[PDB]
Structure formats: structure tokens, C-alpha cells
């Protein structure tokens, strides 16, 4: 799924605790609202623990 | 039953680079971020390493952090070994909806 | 040298050689990711271009 | 600069009720995570509870489950820690912990705390 031409809102992503893994490789998630990117992609699949 | 195993009395050395190892057993510590903190005995604690590789502003450039996924351990090394106040250090990780603290590693003789 | 904190000023030379942090997080003076050696060697061949 | 003031202890009570309050200033109280951390005198650090920015979700450890509670408000910028059915293990110093983006980044905030002993 391709997501673009919208204001990125990661505020609800780190303000929840239902997730188990929030490791961000390459870039630091402490500064995300101040970063400007061109393309944002999101994959989805289900795997065992 | 996530727990972090680390020693209690290391780094008793003058002025070189020594390493402190923090490891877990129930799960892989490389999945989530692991941090390092320092506690002044009789005073408020502070944090030396955050985001598993970064130091806060004002922290000197000497304390190191690294992650080894082969041994499932986190390494904290200090380079300068200056005249810092005696303290103890702990390890933190995240399994599921909970926080887990480390045992503690005393460092008094520098 | 391949890395320099900022742009160098005219008629200036620098001698210091230490691992150059090139990431958001510092590697605190040991060899690893997001830091490399600014000083790297030349390679030549007798039959090169 | 962020100032954290804690004054909720100073008396001994077996199995009673005690209310602790942490005062915070210098930052917005309704956009980060708060938590609470205690440690025994002469022993290691341990975690107590973590609080969302609106108080919708609260969690504690399994050793204190069933008991323990937390409440918050953003109008007065204060945290309320109520206790019930204390035991002899509860001799600890309590610091009101504050987060930045979530509970994976780190704690990085610890008040001076208040001595709490039971007898």
C-alpha cells in the first residue's frame, strides 16, 4: 500500500502500547514529525511469534 | 518472565576501556530498544545511553554502547574512566505491556 | 579524507584523525555502524587507466 | 529545564492507605507519557506503573495487581498515587517517571523522590 500526499501522523503510533515491536532501523523515531520524505510504503503480513 | 542478567562489580580499573555486558534469557533483546542508566547513591538518577546508541545533550563522548545479536547481549563500555562519582548501572528492555529493570552493577573504585 | 564536520576554509589543513560520526546516534569512539574512518588509503595499479 | 517535586510520604502504616503526589512544570502535561518507578534502599531499581497521556490505559506489575491505582489531570499538572493494603516490602523511594514519545525510547526523567518506610 502506497501512502502519499497527506500529513504524516505518527503521534498515535507511539502513544499506544498494544504493539510489541517498535524498532526503527536506519532512522531514529525520536524525530519523525520534523522529517520530510517523498514516498511512504506500508506492507502487511501475519507471522508467528 | 523476561529478565536481564548483568554482573554487580566490574570496571574497577584506572583509565582505560573496559566493557560491561547485559544479556537476557527469555527473549531476544535486539527486538526492542535497550537503554542504560546511572544512579547517584543518595541522589537522583540520570540516563547515559538512550535509543540504544545515543547519549543525551551534555553527556561526555566517552561511554559507548553496542549490540551483539550472536551472544544476545548488550555491551556498555567507558573510555575515559575519569574521576566520576561512584554509582551503579542498570539494564532495561521491553517484552509486552511491562518494564523490566536490571540487577545493578556497582562501580566505586576507579 | 572523506569526511569533514563542515566545509573547510581556504588555505587550511587539518591533521586530526579519529572515527567520524555519520549518523543521528554517536558510536562513542569505537568502530561500528553510522561511523567510519574519514582517513582511507589510496589504491594504484601499474596497468590501470 | 523541568522541575519535579514529590511529597507524599513520611509516616509508617501497616496495611493502610497512603496518597502520593508528584508536581511537574516546564512542559505540556497532555502530550507525553508518565510513569512511576520505585527502588528499595540498598537494592536495585524496579518498575511500578506506566500511564498514557490521557489516563485511558494504565498498567502495573503482577506483584501489585488487584490493588494499586493511578489518576491524572491536565488542568493542574499533577499526578495522584493512591495506595491500599501495604506490606513490609513497600519500604522504597518513589520517583515520578516521565516519557518523551513512548516506553521504548527510555525513562530519562527521575525526580528527587520521597522516602517511604512502613512499620
Is D119 in contact with D14 (CB distance < 8 Å)? Answer: yes
Map grid coordinates 502506497 to a residue: A2
Say whether A31 and C24 touch across the interface (CB within 8 A).
Answer: yes
**CB–CB of D2/D110 below 8 Å?**
no
Q: In terms of C-beta distances under 8 Å and separation of at least 24 residues, what long-range contacts does B78-85 make, across chains too?
A: B78/B11, B78/B17, B78/B18, B79/B17, B79/C28, B79/C29, B80/B15, B81/B11, B81/B13, B81/B14, B81/B15, B81/B16, B81/B17, B81/B18, B81/B110, B82/B110, B83/B110, B84/B110, B85/B40
The three-class DSSP label of residue D87 is coil
Query: How far are the Cα atoms of A2, A27, A36, D54 from residue A8, in angstroms, in the given order?
Result: 13, 16, 9, 22
SS (H, E, C) D31-46: CCCEEEEEECCCCCEE
Compute, in degrees rounded to 10, the torsion defined by CA atoms C19, D106, A45, A47: 100
From which experimental method does this structure derive?
cryo-EM
Residue D86, strand partner residues = none
- Interface contact flag, B96 A28, Cβ < 8 Å: no
Measure the CA angle with vertex C25, ends C20 and C26; round to 5°.
40
- Asked if residues D52 and D43 have their Cβ atoms less than 8 Å apart, the reply is no
**Is B26 in a helix, a strand, or coil?**
coil
Output the DSSP codes for D13-31: -SS-EEEEEEEEESS-TTS
* B54: chain C residues, CB-CB within 8 Å: 24-26
C33 has a chain A CB within 8 A of its CB: no
Chain C positions contacting chain B at CB under 8 Å are 24-30, 32, 34
Quick check: B103 contacting D, CB < 8 Å?
yes
Closest partner CB to A29 (pick from D33, D101, D103): D101
- Cβ-based contacts of A17 with chain B (< 8 Å): 97
D and A touch per CB criterion (3+ pairs under 8 A): yes
3-state secondary structure of D80: strand
**Which chain D residues are closer than 8 Å to A15 by Cβ?**
33, 52-53, 101-102
d(CA D21, CA D6): 6
Q: Are D48 and D57 in contact (CB under 8 A)?
A: no
Is residue D37 within 8 A of residue D108, CB to CB? The reply is no
The C-alpha cell 596497468 sits at C47
The rounded Cα C45 to chain-centroid distance in angstroms is 23
Residues 17-76 of B with CB under 8 A from A: 30-33, 51, 54
In chain B, the DSSP E strands lie at: 4-5, 18-24, 35-39, 45-49, 63-68, 73-78, 87-92, 105-107
The A residues from 1 to 49 touching B (CB cutoff 8 Å) are 17, 20-23, 28, 30
Tell me the CA distances in angstroms from A22 to A13, B33, B60, C31, one per residue in order: 9, 8, 28, 26
Q: Return the HEC string of A1-49.
A: CEECCCCCCCHHHHCCCCCCCCCCCCCCCCCCCCCCCCCEECCCCCCCC
For this experimental structure, what is the resolution in angstroms? 3.4
Query: Closest partner residue to B63 among C25, C28, C32, by Cβ?
Result: C28
> Chain A residue with minimal CA distance to D59?
A17
Q: How many CB pairs under 8 A join A and B?
A: 15
Question: How far is Cα D91 from Cα D42, in angstroms, rounded to an integer?
Answer: 11
Give me the sheet containing D69-73, strands edge to edge: D3-6, D17-25, D78-84, D69-73
Cβ atoms of A21 and B32 closer than 8 Å: yes
Using an 8 Å CB-CB cutoff, list chain D residues near B50: 105-106, 108
Question: CB of B93 within 8 A of CB of B67?
Answer: no
Contact B53 C30 (CB under 8 A): no
Amino acid at each position: 500500500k502506497r501512502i502519499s500526499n497527506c500529513v504524516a501522523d505518527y503521534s498515535v503510533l507511539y502513544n499506544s502500547a498494544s504493539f510489541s515491536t517498535f524498532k526503527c532501523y536506519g532512522v531514529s523515531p525520536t524525530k519523525l514529525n520534523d522529517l520530510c520524505f517523498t514516498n511512504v510504503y506500508a506492507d502487511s503480513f501475519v507471522i508467528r511469534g | 518472565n523476561f529478565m536481564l542478567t548483568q554482573p554487580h562489580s566490574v570496571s574497577e580499573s584506572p583509565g582505560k576501556t573496559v566493557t560491561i555486558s547485559c544479556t537476557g534469557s527469555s527473549g531476544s533483546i535486539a527486538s526492542n530498544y535497550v537503554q542504560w542508566y546511572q544512579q547517584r547513591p543518595g541522589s537522583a538518577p540520570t540516563t547515559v545511553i538512550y535509543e540504544d546508541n545515543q547519549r543525551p545533550s551534555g553527556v561526555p563522548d566517552r561511554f559507548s554502547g553496542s549490540i551483539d545479536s550472536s551472544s544476545n547481549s548488550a555491551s556498555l563500555t567507558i573510555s575515559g574512566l575519569k574521576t566520576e562519582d561512584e554509582a551503579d548501572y542498570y539494564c532495561q528492555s521491553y517484552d509486552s505491556s511491562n518494564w523490566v529493570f536490571g540487577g545493578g552493577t556497582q562501580l566505586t573504585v576507579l | 579524507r572523506l569526511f569533514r564536520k563542515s566545509n573547510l576554509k581556504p588555505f587550511e589543513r587539518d591533521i586530526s584523525t579519529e572515527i567520524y560520526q555519520a549518523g543521528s546516534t554517536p558510536c562513542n569512539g569505537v568502530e561500528g555502524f553510522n561511523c567510519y574512518f574519514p582517513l582511507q588509503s589510496y589504491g594504484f595499479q601499474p596497468t590501470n587507466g | 529545564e523541568v522541575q519535579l517535586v514529590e511529597s507524599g510520604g513520611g509516616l509508617v502504616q501497616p496495611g493502610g492507605s497512603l496518597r502520593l503526589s508528584c508536581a511537574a512544570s516546564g512542559f505540556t502535561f497532555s502530550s507525553y507519557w508518565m510513569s512511576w518507578v520505585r527502588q528499595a534502599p540498598g537494592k536495585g531499581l524496579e518498575w511500578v506503573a506506566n500511564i498514557k497521556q490521557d489516563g485511558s490505559e494504565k498498567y502495573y506489575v503482577d506483584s501489585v495487581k488487584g490493588r494499586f491505582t493511578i489518576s491524572r489531570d491536565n488542568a493542574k499538572n499533577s499526578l495522584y498515587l493512591q495506595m491500599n493494603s501495604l506490606r513490609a516490602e513497600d519500604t522504597a523511594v518513589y520517583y515520578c517517571a516521565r516519557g518523551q514519545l513512548g516506553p521504548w525510547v527510555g525513562v530519562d526523567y527521575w525526580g528527587q523522590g520521597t522516602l517511604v518506610t512502613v512499620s
